[PDB]
Amino acid sequence: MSAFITFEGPEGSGKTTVINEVYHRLVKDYDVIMTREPGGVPTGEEIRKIVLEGNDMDIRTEAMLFAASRREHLVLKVIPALKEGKVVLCDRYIDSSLAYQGYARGIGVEEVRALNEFAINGLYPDLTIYLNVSAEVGRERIIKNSRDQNRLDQEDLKFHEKVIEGYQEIIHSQRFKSVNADQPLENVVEDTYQTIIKYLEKI
Amino acid sequence: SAFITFEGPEGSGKTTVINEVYHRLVKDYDVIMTREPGGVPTGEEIRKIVLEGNDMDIRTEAMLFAASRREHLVLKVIPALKEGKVVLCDRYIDSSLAYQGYARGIGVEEVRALNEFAINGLYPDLTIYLNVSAEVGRERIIKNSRDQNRLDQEDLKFHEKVIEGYQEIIHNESQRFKSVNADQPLENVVEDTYQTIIKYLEK
């Protein structure tokens, strides 16, 4: 049957790699799609461009625009797939907004949750993989992946720590499954894949 | 000194923009503009090998363009930077990544490795991305083509892929990147680019 599976984690958690590798394994046996907001949905792309073009934009305005883009992605892409009985793998969803805008940026987690409950109208994921990386491991991955940087500055280090603190508060319901993302990526992929098959096959 | 690159797909107004921005900048800054390989003889000779090729392997092409890029860098750009000049360049590593790495399918991590070898740590201080939507870009190309009234399918698909490659590169949110809305009339694209550059130089 259908399943809406989201992937969450801070920068440096291996998330992009993980979702892609898992998608490539799952597609052999499941009617699966992989997406990331706005996912090619034109209204979502237009909304997101307003944020990209913003100049010192108010963070609550940004959050509302992201929530609107989220809804467009959900109604025009995700829900149609779930109605066809597909497995939908989504790279970031409500929890990202809560950790980044709510906690790290300081709007407030409850405030951003209220906004996002309006946007999703009850459509919480069936399963959410939290790629649980420590700040230090994540930092090295971020430096490695960053084309132009060899060390992170203090502002970036602190923000990364605050995002992790936020996610830790959020994950402390049954939809969340944590995977140890401090392991080599090959193991993070394997643990994630096994977590998902157990959910899908109800074993 | 500042090394500033301009990037964007065909139909982004790049040629017009760099030329007009340079004209204004010359009045107030010690600045030069160069079109890679910039008349550097070795860079030109290396490039000619590609231009005269017959069904040449794309990796061979990429390595030759990288060697040509390095000659431009060591013989023309770096000496100008060392003299305190601002150097505007019409294409650089982001173009190779979007075109060769993503669109032509060599692989982004592979082209990144080659780019890194070629530049030996010399990243732009500032990169202006002329962010055009595929549809406006398409229409600009048709407008500027004296021999075509419509683009063929293959060319449309390739254009879309290059834009998608650039979108992945700016999703990385590196501070050197600054996105300019290239869907606007060119007069506005020029103005926004010029204001972006002066803000950086006066910081």
Q: Which amino acid is at B59?
A: R
DSSP letter string over A135-195?
HHHHHHHHHHH-SS-SS--HHHHHHHHHHHHHHHHHH--TTEEEEETTS-HHHHHHHHHHH
Q: Do the Cβ atoms of B141 and B11 come closer than 8 Å?
A: yes
**CB contact B125 to A (< 8 Å):** no
Q: Do the Cβ atoms of A107 and A61 come closer than 8 Å?
A: no
Q: Phi and psi for B53 in degrees, rounded to 5?
A: -65, 160
- Taking an 8 Å cut-off on Cβ atoms, the answer to whether B172 and A147 are in contact is yes
DSSP letter string over B20-52?
HHHHHHHTTS-EEEE-TTTT-HHHHHHHHHHHT
> For residue A54, how many C-alpha atoms fall within 13 Å in the half-sphere facing its CB?
17
Which residues does A169 contact at the CB level (< 8 Å), separation at least 6? A103, A109
Nearest CA to CA, how far is A148 from chain B (Å)?
7
Q: Do the Cβ atoms of A41 and A73 come closer than 8 Å?
A: yes
Q: Do the Cβ atoms of B139 and B186 come closer than 8 Å?
A: no
**CB contact B112 to A (< 8 Å):** yes
Compute the Cα dihedral for A30, A36, A39, A43 and give only its sign.
positive
Chain A residues close to B172, C-beta within 8 Å: 145-147
CA-based nearest residue to B66, from B90, B88, B103, B37: B37
Nearest CA to CA, how far is B123 from chain A (Å)?
7
Say if residue B10 carries a ligand binding annotation.
yes
Distance between CA B2 and CA B81 in Å, rounded?
7
Encoding tokens for residue A99? 């950790």
Distance between CA A179 and CA A7 in Å, rounded?
11
Encoding tokens for residue B32? 């030069």
Minimum-distance CB partner of B112 among A49, A53, A147: A147
Cis peptide before B37 (omega within 30 of 0): yes
Q: Do the Cβ atoms of B137 and B163 come closer than 8 Å?
A: yes
Encoding tokens for residue B5? 């690159």
Chain A residues close to B174, C-beta within 8 Å: 146-149
Distance between CA B173 and CA A148 in Å, rounded?
11
**CB contact B164 to A (< 8 Å):** no
Helix axes B134-144, B153-170, angle to 10 degrees: 130
Given the structure tokens 């060697």, which residue do they identify? B67
Give the helix/strand (H/E) hosting B166: helix B153-170
Q: Which of A147, A152, A153, A155 to mutate to test the interface with B (most CBs of B within 10 A)?
A: A147
Say if residue B96 carries a ligand binding annotation.
no
Give first-to-last CA distance, chain A, whole Å.
15
**CB contact A134 to B (< 8 Å):** no
Say if residue A11 carries a ligand binding annotation.
yes
Give the helix/strand (H/E) hosting B177: strand B177-181
User: Across-strand partners of B31?
Assistant: B86
Q: Which of A15, A148, A159, A185 to mutate to test the interface with B (most CBs of B within 10 A)?
A: A148
Number of separate domains in chain A: 1
Nearest CA in chain B to A39: B164
Give the helix/strand (H/E) hosting B15: helix B14-26
Give the helix/strand (H/E) hosting B67: helix B58-72
What is the domain range of residue B71?
1-203
Nearest CA in chain B to A49: B181
Other C-beta atoms lying within 10 Å of the C-beta of residue B47: 20
B84: left (phi over 0), alpha (psi -120 to 50) or beta: left
Which residues does B177 contact at the CB level (< 8 Å), separation at least 6? B127, B129, B169, B170
In the DSSP assignment, the letter for residue B2 is E
**CB contact B195 to A (< 8 Å):** no
Give the C-alpha distances (Å, rounded to integers) separating A125 from A57, A71, A82, B81, B195: 29, 14, 11, 52, 44
**CB contact A53 to B (< 8 Å):** yes
Nearest CA to CA, how far is B46 from chain A (Å)?
26
- Taking an 8 Å cut-off on Cβ atoms, the answer to whether B174 and A146 are in contact is yes
What does this entry list as its resolution, in Å? 1.5
Q: How do strand A127-132 and strand B2-7 relate by DSSP bridges?
A: unpaired
**CB contact A144 to B (< 8 Å):** no
Distance between CA A81 and CA A139 in Å, rounded?
35
Distance between CA A100 and CA A116 in Å, rounded?
13
Chain B residues close to A147, C-beta within 8 Å: 112, 123, 172, 174
Q: What is the CATH number of the domain that holds A14?
A: 3.40.50.300
- Taking an 8 Å cut-off on Cβ atoms, the answer to whether B172 and A49 are in contact is no
